[PDB]
């Protein structure tokens, strides 16, 4: 197995990083490396600090990150079962969308 970001014996078609191999992450293989973005949640008084990993420039269409899934997964992982948490989901979605905007399609800054 692999821990995180380790090289895997599988050549990456869209090897934008230049490594030439797919990298292991979260139980899957990605052509590139994810980009890290800090984020904070304040639901129910408690504050949780987390790093969102955003995937982009992936050859596989299904492998590209979707904001509505990332935010929902994060909210359900940190605040499971809280009533009316969809407001937090919308806030996280908006923050991620604003933060991940690329002015030039070349600012690849892998972690």
């Amino acid at each position: 197995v692999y821990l995180d970001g380790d090289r895997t014996n599988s050549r990456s078609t869209g090897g934008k990083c230049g490594c030439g191999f797919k990298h292991f992450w979260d139980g899957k293989e990605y052509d590139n490396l994810p980009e890290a973005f800090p984020i904070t949640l304040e639901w129910g008084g408690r504050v949780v600090r987390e790093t969102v990993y955003w995937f982009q420039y992936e050859s596989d269409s299904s492998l590209n990150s979707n904001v509505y899934d990332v935010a929902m997964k994060l909210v359900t992982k940190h605040f499971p079962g809280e009533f009316g948490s969809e407001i937090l989901v919308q806030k996280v979605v908006h923050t991620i969308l604003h933060q991940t905007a690329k002015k030039n399609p070349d600012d690849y800054t892998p972690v």
């Binding site: 359900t76 499971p80 079962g81 809280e82 009533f83 009316g84 948490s85 407001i87």
Partner: protein, 559 residues
């Protein structure tokens, strides 16, 4: 003349009016000798066209009593002073021809609300009416009846004791009432074999007796016009047999109904639901609780008196959306044969935005009139959610509309059989004041349907549509697993839509070969195709929310 059999939908009201008026009129000597006060004033509510002059005329004719008619506008059109003379002469003549009934057609015209009337002549007329009504203690066996639209449109001085004390409310006809009205109005006409008045009676939702009479006249006239241009029988007179040679068809009724403007459409619907327990499977415990809470006090009052147990005021249903919270209320209302009044969330939001919370009182008054009744409030959390939510903006969960609901439910006697049911899918933000021992003490959880209930849901949804015998609903119910009622009904709707589209396409294609019923039922392939669009509305996180809420509620009680 008009008879008792001419009346249509209003049957209970006719019984009340008969029991109130027949005894003093048919036996004047019995009431004159005995020391019991007969009623002196009767007030009839209801929107215009429901039939109120008809009822009074029928009662007067059946009882064989003199009938004197007074029109509001007719009396108000006279000169100043002459109107009072007309009123006095009418009352004197009615007194002379004892027993007699005086009918005042437009009471709100003569005596409207106090602020509405400004001239002193109008107030003089109202005072003259009050004096004449109070002068009936001489007991010449004269009964005064009046008609209006709203209880509040009349001067409150006219509802005083000794003058228009009694009250009969005539509402919108139900399905059976509309069928009876149609049968009455179509007696003289001749129909065709394909015309069934029951179906059109079901379709006409917000019509009153006048609307149904207009509909019948329009259909008959359309048929006559459709036949006359072809027959072109424009002579000096009209033949007898030509009328009997033509009949009204179902297409004429459909066209007339499609070109009809109902009058009473915004009025609250107060009817007995047609939904039975078969429409929703499972939830036997909820059925038992509902029967115990709403059926026992209305059928065994002696038991409650003997044990001194105050009947429960109401319950609150909470659970994920679309699981059938309204169907349970409708079914329990139907099983007890009690009227059902539903107040949706948009009504509460309109009352909150416009600050017209006083209307809440009126609602309960209606529920007080049609007892026994089941009063249903849907989305009680809508007000709280609209002004914030879990966090909110200002103070607690109290507001205007909810406060008025509380102050009206608290001041409601248990002798009347009015039961209040509330529904909400966000029990967290509900006002704790409602959840009080004496207003809405019971909390009932309505979970997602189980395997045995989904089959019943599918059967209830599909009972209206043809289905091929090859369709195996058990496998579909097994495969759904985590669906709600709102999803199963969507699956059925998509299957029907696919079938309709295929039928239309096949019919269009088969017309292309004509220049030189392929699908009678719904096959299994339609369901297989429709299942590709099936979406699960309630996630697992929502189930976690509701289960944790129920577990927190339940863990308090342990013994």
């Amino acid at each position: 003349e008009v008879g008792y059999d001419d009346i249509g939908g209003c049957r209970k009201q006719l019984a009340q009016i008969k029991e109130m008026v027949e005894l003093p009129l048919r036996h004047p000597a019995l009431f004159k000798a005995i020391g019991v006060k007969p009623p002196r004033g009767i007030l009839l509510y209801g929107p215009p066209g429901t039939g109120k002059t008809l009822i009074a005329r029928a009662v007067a004719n059946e009882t064989g009593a003199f009938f004197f008619l007074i029109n509001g506008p007719e009396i108000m059109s006279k000169l100043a002073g002459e109107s009072e003379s007309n009123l006095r002469k009418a009352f004197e003549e009615a007194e002379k021809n004892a027993p007699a009934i005086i009918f005042i057609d437009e009471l709100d015209a003569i005596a409207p609300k106090r602020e509405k009337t400004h001239g002193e002549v109008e107030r003089r007329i109202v005072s003259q009416l009050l004096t004449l009504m109070d002068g009936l203690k001489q007991r010449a066996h004269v009964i005064v009846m009046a008609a209006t639209n709203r209880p509040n449109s009349i001067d409150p001085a006219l509802r005083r004791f000794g003058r228009f004390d009694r009250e009969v409310d005539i509402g919108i006809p139900d399905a059976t009432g509309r069928l009876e009205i149609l049968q009455i109005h179509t007696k003289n006409m001749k129909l065709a074999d394909d015309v069934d008045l029951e179906q059109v009676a079901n379709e006409t939702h917000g019509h009153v007796g006048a609307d149904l009479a207009a509909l019948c006249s329009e259909a008959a006239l359309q048929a006559i016009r459709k036949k006359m241009d072809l027959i072109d029988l424009e002579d000096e007179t009209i033949d007898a047999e030509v009328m009997n040679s033509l009949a009204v068809t179902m297409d004429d009724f459909r066209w007339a109904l499609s070109q009809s403007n109902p009058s009473a459409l915004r009025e609250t619907v107060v009817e007995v639901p047609q939904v039975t327990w078969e429409d929703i499977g499972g939830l036997e415990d909820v059925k038992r609780e509902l029967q115990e809470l709403v059926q026992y006090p209305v059928e065994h009052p002696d038991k409650f008196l003997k044990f001194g147990m105050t009947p429960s005021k109401g319950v609150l249903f909470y659970g994920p959306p679309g699981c059938g919270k309204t169907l349970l209320a409708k079914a329990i209302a139907n099983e007890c044969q009690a009227n059902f009044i539903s107040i949706k969330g948009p009504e509460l939001l309109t009352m909150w935005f416009g600050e017209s919370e006083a209307n809440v009182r009126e609602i309960f008054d209606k529920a007080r009139q049609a007892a026994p009744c089941v009063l249903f409030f849907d989305e009680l959390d809508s007000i709280a959610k609209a002004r914030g939510g879990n966090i909110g903006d200002g103070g607690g969960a109290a507001d205007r509309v909810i406060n008025q609901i509380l102050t009206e439910m608290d001041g409601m006697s248990t002798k009347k059989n009015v039961f209040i049911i509330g529904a909400t899918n966000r029990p967290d933000i509900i006002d704790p004041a409602i959840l009080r021992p004496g207003r809405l003490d019971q909390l009932i959880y309505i979970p997602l349907p189980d395997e045995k209930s989904r089959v019943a849901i599918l059967k209830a949804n599909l009972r209206k549509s043809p289905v091929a015998k090859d369709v195996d609903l058990e496998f579909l119910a097994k495969m759904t697993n985590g669906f709600s009622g709102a999803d199963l009904t969507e699956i059925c709707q998509r299957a029907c839509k696919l079938a309709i589209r295929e039928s239309i396409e096949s019919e269009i294609r088969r017309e292309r070969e004509r220049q030189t019923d392929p699908v009678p039922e719904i096959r299994r392939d339609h369901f297989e195709e429709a299942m590709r669009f099936a979406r699960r509305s309630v996630s697992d996180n929502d189930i976690r929310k509701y289960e944790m809420f129920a577990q927190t509620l339940q863990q308090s009680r342990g013994f």
